[PDB]
Design a protein around this ligand. Sequence first.
Ligand SMILES: *[C@@H]1O[C@H](CO)[C@@H](O[C@@H]2O[C@H](CO)[C@@H](O[C@@H]3O[C@H](CO[C@H]4O[C@H](CO)[C@@H](O)[C@H](O)[C@@H]4O)[C@@H](O)[C@H](O[C@H]4O[C@H](CO)[C@@H](O)[C@H](O)[C@@H]4O)[C@@H]3O)[C@H](O)[C@H]2NC(C)=O)[C@H](O)[C@H]1NC(C)=O
Ligand SMILES: *[C@@H]1O[C@H](CO)[C@@H](O[C@@H]2O[C@H](CO)[C@@H](O[C@@H]3O[C@H](CO[C@H]4O[C@H](CO)[C@@H](O)[C@H](O)[C@@H]4O)[C@@H](O)[C@H](O[C@H]4O[C@H](CO)[C@@H](O)[C@H](O)[C@@H]4O)[C@@H]3O)[C@H](O)[C@H]2NC(C)=O)[C@H](O)[C@H]1NC(C)=O
Ligand SMILES: *[C@@H]1O[C@H](CO)[C@@H](O[C@@H]2O[C@H](CO)[C@@H](O[C@@H]3O[C@H](CO[C@H]4O[C@H](CO)[C@@H](O)[C@H](O)[C@@H]4O)[C@@H](O)[C@H](O[C@H]4O[C@H](CO)[C@@H](O)[C@H](O)[C@@H]4O)[C@@H]3O)[C@H](O)[C@H]2NC(C)=O)[C@H](O)[C@H]1NC(C)=O
Ligand SMILES: *[C@@H]1O[C@H](CO)[C@@H](O[C@@H]2O[C@H](CO)[C@@H](O)[C@H](O)[C@H]2NC(C)=O)[C@H](O)[C@H]1NC(C)=O
Ligand SMILES: *[C@@H]1O[C@H](CO)[C@@H](O[C@@H]2O[C@H](CO)[C@@H](O)[C@H](O)[C@H]2NC(C)=O)[C@H](O)[C@H]1NC(C)=O
Ligand SMILES: *[C@@H]1O[C@H](CO)[C@@H](O[C@@H]2O[C@H](CO)[C@@H](O)[C@H](O)[C@H]2NC(C)=O)[C@H](O)[C@H]1NC(C)=O
Ligand SMILES: *[C@@H]1O[C@H](CO)[C@@H](O)[C@H](O)[C@H]1NC(C)=O
Ligand SMILES: *[C@@H]1O[C@H](CO)[C@@H](O)[C@H](O)[C@H]1NC(C)=O
Ligand SMILES: *[C@@H]1O[C@H](CO)[C@@H](O)[C@H](O)[C@H]1NC(C)=O
Ligand SMILES: *[C@@H]1O[C@H](CO)[C@@H](O)[C@H](O)[C@H]1NC(C)=O
Ligand SMILES: *[C@@H]1O[C@H](CO)[C@@H](O)[C@H](O)[C@H]1NC(C)=O
Lengths: 448, 448, 448, 122, 122, 122
Amino acid sequence: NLWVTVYYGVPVWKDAETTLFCASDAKAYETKKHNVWATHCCVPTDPNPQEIHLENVTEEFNMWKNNMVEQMHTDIISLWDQSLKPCVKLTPLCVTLQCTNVTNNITDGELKNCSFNMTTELRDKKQKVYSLFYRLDVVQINNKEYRLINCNTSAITQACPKVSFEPIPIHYCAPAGFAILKCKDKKFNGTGPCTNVSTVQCTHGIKPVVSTQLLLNGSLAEEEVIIRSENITNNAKNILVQLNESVQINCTRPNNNTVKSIRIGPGQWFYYTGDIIGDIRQAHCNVSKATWNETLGKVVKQLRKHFGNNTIIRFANSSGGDLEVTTHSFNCGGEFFYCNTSGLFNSTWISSNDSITLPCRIKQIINMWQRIGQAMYAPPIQGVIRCVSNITGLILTRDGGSTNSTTETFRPGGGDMRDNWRSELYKYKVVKIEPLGVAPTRCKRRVV
Amino acid sequence: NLWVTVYYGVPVWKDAETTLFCASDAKAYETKKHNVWATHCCVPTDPNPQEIHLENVTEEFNMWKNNMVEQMHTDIISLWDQSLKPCVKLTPLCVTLQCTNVTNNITDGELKNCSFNMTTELRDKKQKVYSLFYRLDVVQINNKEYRLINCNTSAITQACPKVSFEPIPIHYCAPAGFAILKCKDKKFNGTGPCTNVSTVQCTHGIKPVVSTQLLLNGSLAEEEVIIRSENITNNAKNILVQLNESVQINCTRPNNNTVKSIRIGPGQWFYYTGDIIGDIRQAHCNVSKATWNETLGKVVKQLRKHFGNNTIIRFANSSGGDLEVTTHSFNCGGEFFYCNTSGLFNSTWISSNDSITLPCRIKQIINMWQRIGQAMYAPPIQGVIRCVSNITGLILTRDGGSTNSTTETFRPGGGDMRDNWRSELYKYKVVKIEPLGVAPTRCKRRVV
Amino acid sequence: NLWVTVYYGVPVWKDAETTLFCASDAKAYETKKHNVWATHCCVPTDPNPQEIHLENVTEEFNMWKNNMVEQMHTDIISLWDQSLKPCVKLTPLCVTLQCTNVTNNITDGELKNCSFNMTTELRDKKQKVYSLFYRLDVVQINNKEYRLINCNTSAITQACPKVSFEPIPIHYCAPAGFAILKCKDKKFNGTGPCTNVSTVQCTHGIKPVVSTQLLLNGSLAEEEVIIRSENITNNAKNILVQLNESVQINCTRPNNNTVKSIRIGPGQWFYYTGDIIGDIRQAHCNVSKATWNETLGKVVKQLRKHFGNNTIIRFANSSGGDLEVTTHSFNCGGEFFYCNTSGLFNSTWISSNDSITLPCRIKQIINMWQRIGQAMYAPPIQGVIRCVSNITGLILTRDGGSTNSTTETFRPGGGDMRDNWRSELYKYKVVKIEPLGVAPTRCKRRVV
Amino acid sequence: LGFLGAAGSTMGAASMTLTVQARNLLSGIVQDTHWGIKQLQARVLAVEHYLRDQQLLGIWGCSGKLICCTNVPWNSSWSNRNLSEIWDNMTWLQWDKEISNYTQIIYGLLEESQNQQEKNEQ
Amino acid sequence: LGFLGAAGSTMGAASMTLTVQARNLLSGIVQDTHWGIKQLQARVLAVEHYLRDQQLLGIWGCSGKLICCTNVPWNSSWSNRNLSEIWDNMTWLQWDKEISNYTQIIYGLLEESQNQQEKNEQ
Amino acid sequence: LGFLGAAGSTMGAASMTLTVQARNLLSGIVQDTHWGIKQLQARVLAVEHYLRDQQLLGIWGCSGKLICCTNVPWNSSWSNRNLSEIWDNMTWLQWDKEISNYTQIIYGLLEESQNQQEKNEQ
Ligand SMILES: *[C@@H]1O[C@H](CO)[C@@H](O[C@@H]2O[C@H](CO)[C@@H](O[C@@H]3O[C@H](CO[C@H]4O[C@H](CO)[C@@H](O)[C@H](O)[C@@H]4O)[C@@H](O)[C@H](O[C@H]4O[C@H](CO)[C@@H](O)[C@H](O)[C@@H]4O)[C@@H]3O)[C@H](O)[C@H]2NC(C)=O)[C@H](O)[C@H]1NC(C)=O
Ligand SMILES: *[C@@H]1O[C@H](CO)[C@@H](O[C@@H]2O[C@H](CO)[C@@H](O[C@@H]3O[C@H](CO[C@H]4O[C@H](CO)[C@@H](O)[C@H](O)[C@@H]4O)[C@@H](O)[C@H](O[C@H]4O[C@H](CO)[C@@H](O)[C@H](O)[C@@H]4O)[C@@H]3O)[C@H](O)[C@H]2NC(C)=O)[C@H](O)[C@H]1NC(C)=O
Ligand SMILES: *[C@@H]1O[C@H](CO)[C@@H](O[C@@H]2O[C@H](CO)[C@@H](O[C@@H]3O[C@H](CO[C@H]4O[C@H](CO)[C@@H](O)[C@H](O)[C@@H]4O)[C@@H](O)[C@H](O[C@H]4O[C@H](CO)[C@@H](O)[C@H](O)[C@@H]4O)[C@@H]3O)[C@H](O)[C@H]2NC(C)=O)[C@H](O)[C@H]1NC(C)=O
Ligand SMILES: *[C@@H]1O[C@H](CO)[C@@H](O[C@@H]2O[C@H](CO)[C@@H](O)[C@H](O)[C@H]2NC(C)=O)[C@H](O)[C@H]1NC(C)=O
Ligand SMILES: *[C@@H]1O[C@H](CO)[C@@H](O[C@@H]2O[C@H](CO)[C@@H](O)[C@H](O)[C@H]2NC(C)=O)[C@H](O)[C@H]1NC(C)=O
Ligand SMILES: *[C@@H]1O[C@H](CO)[C@@H](O[C@@H]2O[C@H](CO)[C@@H](O)[C@H](O)[C@H]2NC(C)=O)[C@H](O)[C@H]1NC(C)=O
Ligand SMILES: *[C@@H]1O[C@H](CO)[C@@H](O)[C@H](O)[C@H]1NC(C)=O
Ligand SMILES: *[C@@H]1O[C@H](CO)[C@@H](O)[C@H](O)[C@H]1NC(C)=O
Ligand SMILES: *[C@@H]1O[C@H](CO)[C@@H](O)[C@H](O)[C@H]1NC(C)=O
Ligand SMILES: *[C@@H]1O[C@H](CO)[C@@H](O)[C@H](O)[C@H]1NC(C)=O
Ligand SMILES: *[C@@H]1O[C@H](CO)[C@@H](O)[C@H](O)[C@H]1NC(C)=O
């Protein structure tokens, strides 16, 4: 007595993977800021991004299988490489160097004073160039003989000095036929059902900040510190900790540099460090002590909800590996800092700022995203650099190998950039709209 | 008593911007002429381009806001750069040169006899190359020391000698969903209504001639000389003058050259000027005097319609700037001429040919479209070059700063290539077809 | 009394040209084999490629006008060039060489022992490199002076040593809207009607084997040897002979090489021949004599069906030209062999294996597809190479110039790679589906 | 009269050639290096426009017709012009300008009316 | 209620907004360097999905309707749920899951029924 | 019989599978480096062909049917073959060849007849 009735425009959906649009929200002018995040992502945002609450809709989310993470990862790497494509190559720098130690009021053999025969715009002429290098970029060959560290492995290019990499918020938007579901559950831990779901065509803006060990300038958790992981008991997985408060970090590169430049080919401008005005000081970052102490105490209180309130939680520094992994790596003013975070993790919890200072190292030859291949040369920045960042979260790992002593050890591990995007994208899922479907009705087609 | 009736296929349109197709009209064989204007633009034309007159249709045009100008500009630059992409680079020429003056029957230190150590196909061997250069391409470094002028700024590449840049007429065609409206009003001045409008799918063919100050080989006005500008009273705007007659210009490069070539790498053929057979003569262009005199007298008669018939109009030469702006620049037989047009503008109008000769300079290193960047090296052409061009128009500017003395001054200014395309494209506008619409009718849908 | 009735979804088609999809059939892992035929062609095949027999359908085929041949040709060349695009350039090898003869137990001045000043990762350092070359890759300049043969013509690049070019079967599949018709007539000679036709969405897999004169590893004819040509009587056309049996050929490069490598730039690894362990032996290929003799006897029996059974058929070797044409060229283990096939064609037919050995030459600098342009450098392979191939067919040409003596001469000519793809693709044709059409019916539309 | 031949005709007469324009919307059927990407984008865009208009005719119940009547009454606020001037003196170009601020109103009314009709048909 | 505003509504009520979703399938109408190729691919794909669904409605005889009845009877093996629960308590999201293994069955039946009807109409 | 299974069948019998071919025209739904641009072009082209044919069915008044009758009479100049041979002995492949010079004539007649019908329906 019932027949099939076909309905079109039915509000249902299925999990799907697709390509999202990149929108800038007009925070920068492509032609005035020359910001790589403004160019390419030139699509404007919706000035009135009306969100639609879905009443009585329950949906499941999984941040660890969320395809948006891969999409962000691929697009960032591509943007970066495209941005450096037209810049001056520095392969003429793979020459031997004659180097000595800096003749200044220095306390820590961090800086090398090197000279070399560099090319000029004419093939018949060479020029003597004198510059300072940080020791991490320069290695020995055998008034001593040195070469740049990248020369036995890959080509090195100069970042264009006119191009900014400063992140701006980026909004991702669904292509027509797709929609983005946002989970508003304040306690959402990255997986399972969420009963507070709304639909948007675009995500909020996320700044593509690269920061390895500590999550900087991200969003904050509301109400409580939230600890999320793929598997609580798997010591091979990272733990992403989102704070509900922020910690300010003051990072400085105090040496006042004079930046010099030469032509090394036909319009091929090369920038170098010149020399240092004043005395020599070590780069470093400052965190208020009380703030840091409370921050971890809160993290411990929450970790205990997974391991037991009768447990002991200790923090320790990096276990070992390359600086890109063991130190806190971030971009501050165009400069690349590698800070010694061991000063932050020397504490155990059991049942007038006095800021902690982390010494930092500086590198000019940068291998992005743990790739073996071309290196980027970061030109020096004229003057002195200072910035203040917000720690909004941490990446922790456990050693494992536990004998159930309850004395578990956590370290500032991880280092895989996908996790620093996952930490924001966890709120969103993308689905495909499936408008066609059927249901029984007490209706039959007129018979013909 | 009236209801909405929906009609589809309604013959209406709106102003729009889109991308046009490039059609060749088969004037050249891609594989026999190796003409850059034949390749890429390989779409054939309509052998029967039926035009449709629109009876009783009034439409407005604006040549100064016509998007087709930008489309032509972008496509020409791209074609040019793609065409040179696979050609031999001449960066090995940025070497010092030893130069003297030409040892010939020369009256005007125009030519430099230079020698240098050039590369060969093997890295272990160098060769001595002797060639002549025009002084405009060669500058001093400090038997005197010289370098090529581009070497402190940008890479230089050789135009492939096998590739022709000779313009052929190009037709632009609308993509489906769009149409081109052509204005036939004989007095159309570039803006406002036109009552004689027809629709075509393609424009007529326009030759993409590059000519700066004088408009060459374009179309002629009918009936009267037409003077068009964005703003008559704005001295910051150019005045485009379209003649209703033509002036023939005979341009010659009389020196008989022997062209030589060497390998400077693995199949990397380089061409150079060799030497000159016979005596040395200055490049120049000839215009009949009476013709030129009448040509400007007609222009003055028409300029007075905007400034007053009681005014005084004087012509003067270029105000200053680079040769690419101050001289008349054009491509004649592959060679690049920079002619001194001051000989054409030394006259004031108030209430047996005796041809005027304009001396010309020759350059081999060419910076197209006022860009700072890569330069094109124009290889020399074996023998002697002569061509005859049609002046079909002029670009004039006013000095302004007038005190209403009525003695207004006009100069052969401008130099922005977009204007030399605007001068032909002014007849066409592109619109989008909007086939769907409604109107009241005394008809109601059968009620169900 | 009849009216037009319109039918949609009508099973008819027309000859058409389109683009086909490349499917791998998962015979290799892109990431484990690094096979160029697995990457790019990553589309999976249909695990159940149901074929549809067309009952009572007669269709005409023409292998000589079959667009699939051109499609395969273009795609193979492109794949090859894309595959070599990221590899190390060897232009620093265009240096002079000092060479002597190999100091070993060699009987045939095939190998040259050369030394040269090669680049290093630093611009200030050079290194002495010693390597052996086959004489075909090295030419004289004037302890004797030599250069690589390609240096006066084009750039040379190194094939990436990690990349395999070993062919795997490739299936071509129609895009939606198109279908492929397969002819099953056992006697199909390449042209005219076929009454046994089925429709498939994909062709069977064809291995893209490059083999010039002899067709290797292809399919076999059933029942009889089939001789196909565009024109039997045109001596300017090739004759493709498909065997209904196979001949095994054992090809070896017996010299045991030690392969060495150096950096010649920043990660720019270069491979060279090092030296030879043991004595020196000539590369060669073995074919059983009886098998070869029967193979040609069968070919003759069939050739006589076109020329007369009272004729005399003789086989002769190549008429002349470059090794790429006159010898049998193939890829065996990554190595490039040029074998002297004259040993196979020294016989006339009229009304304990004792294998025939063909001496072979080896080349490292390879010009693919008779193009003038970049050469590929085939790195040497560590150890000793042996492979066994299946001759599945031959390319023969006639001398022509006949005086009707009946003593016709056939040679292993041709050499155009398109023919070695045509030899497999002849079974397939692609057509466009034309679903819309009309027919008379005794039906009129309800009148309104 | 050919494509847009009726552009200057009055609305009544112009309706006689509606098939002329309809057939020129998919004419693109006859018509890497960026030259290729630009042409491909143009083709995709033409398809999208065709479908957007066809979808609206679908939504309004006129998918199969060049001319269709609906159940939505005409508002004098859109136009109070004499019906005879609209069909005999006015052209479609003029008309589109005359009621240009109402297209989105009329379309919304058409969407609602058709949806109500289908609700009732079930 | 806006796009997908009815997603949590029961099936009966949800049908009141079918035009809301239909109009958001071709919204791409408002929306070389590989950034360009990716966007172009997305646009083409959206068109292909639209057409595939529209073709099925065509094949089943419902090309011009948001809601249409057919001649294919409902199987209790698909669902034996009370008709009133289906329209008043159940939502479309739940429903799709409930009968998800039958979509291809129902579609095959619709194709056959419509083809038979047309055969008989001739 | 499967796709084109009816290709050798006579016209009458062949009509029994019209849905088989119709569903294989948009099968592309299941199916920078120039490899990508070539595939994308193929997809766009398939869409354009689909729409061009669908538009004609629209124009002729047969948008929703696999089989439809019109008001245009059959010309003996196109074919004077016995109706029974046309449906029982002849195949569609043969038929297309038989009347191949008239497709554009028939289509023009269909366009005119449908436009006249709509004019009169208003
Ligand atoms: C977390 O977020 C904070 C901010 O919320 C980031 O810190 C900011 O970092 C940027 C870049 O390092 C700093 O901007 C720089 O400021 C320099 C000084 O500007 C002064 O004058 C302007 C005048 O209006 C004031 O607005 C400004 O506050 C200062 O008073 C500029 O000289 C720098 O310009 C450089 O880039 C431009 C780009 O085109 C070039 O043209 C210039 O020549 C030059 O190269 C730049 O503007 C900003 O001040 C910082 N904010 C604060 C509060 O310090 C953190 O870095 C971020 N954390 C992470 C990890 O990213
Ligand atoms: C305004 O328009 C005029 C023409 O209306 C242009 O002047 C023409 O310019 C072209 C190019 O500079 C000239 O063509 C050249 O002619 C040379 C001599 O050809 C003679 O023999 C042929 C045989 O059939 C005759 O047809 C011809 O009239 C002459 O008698 C050729 O040698 C040149 O060939 C070069 O290019 C080809 C391209 O592939 C190469 O293969 C050759 O090796 C060689 O490089 C060329 O054909 C043409 O003659 C000029 N016309 C006149 C009347 O002089 C103006 O230049 C144009 N104005 C502007 C500003 O562009
Ligand atoms: C006609 O078809 C025949 C086969 O039907 C082809 O001959 C084959 O050619 C391939 C390539 O030249 C040969 O494969 C090579 O074998 C070497 C030895 O492998 C031994 O051990 C494996 C272990 O499982 C056995 O399976 C195998 O049979 C042998 O016992 C390998 O070392 C070679 O590897 C190379 O390539 C890989 C690719 O990533 C690299 O990683 C390696 O480092 C190395 O470079 C390779 O596998 C194959 O054995 C041949 N078959 C026979 C029977 O000899 C003909 O060449 C073909 N004709 C033409 C003209 O193409
Ligand atoms: C790095 O080395 C350079 C080279 O010796 C030092 O520059 C020299 O400083 C002396 C000091 O009077 C001058 O007389 C020389 O002329 C300078 N050389 C040049 C090339 O200018 C430089 O000071 C050293 N820098 C540091 C920080 O040690
Ligand atoms: C440009 O300079 C070259 C180099 O000196 C001149 O060529 C020489 O001319 C003399 C004249 O007898 C010869 O003996 C030399 O052998 C020539 N040199 C070479 C390298 O061939 C050349 O004539 C000068 N050209 C001009 C125009 O001044
Ligand atoms: C190719 O030439 C090289 C260079 O002379 C030969 O290598 C030398 O062999 C002698 C033999 O005792 C050694 O003493 C030298 O030290 C070797 N030179 C180097 C650079 O190692 C090489 O043997 C020759 N190879 C052949 C096959 O003739
Ligand atoms: C700098 O001083 C340190 C002190 O131990 C020494 O090891 C190093 O070699 C010196 N480097 C140079 C370049 O003088
Ligand atoms: C340049 O090369 C010379 C070798 O001739 C060397 O002595 C000199 O130190 C080099 N210059 C520099 C600055 O290294
Ligand atoms: C050529 O002669 C002029 C004459 O003034 C002189 O200034 C110039 O330096 C000379 N140039 C060379 C290269 O001899
Ligand atoms: C090798 O020996 C042959 C023998 O004729 C001789 O011609 C050739 O020049 C020799 N080559 C070298 C490089 O010694
Ligand atoms: C390197 O160049 C020198 C010239 O200074 C030459 O004597 C030597 O033989 C070259 N080395 C080799 C291996 O050819």
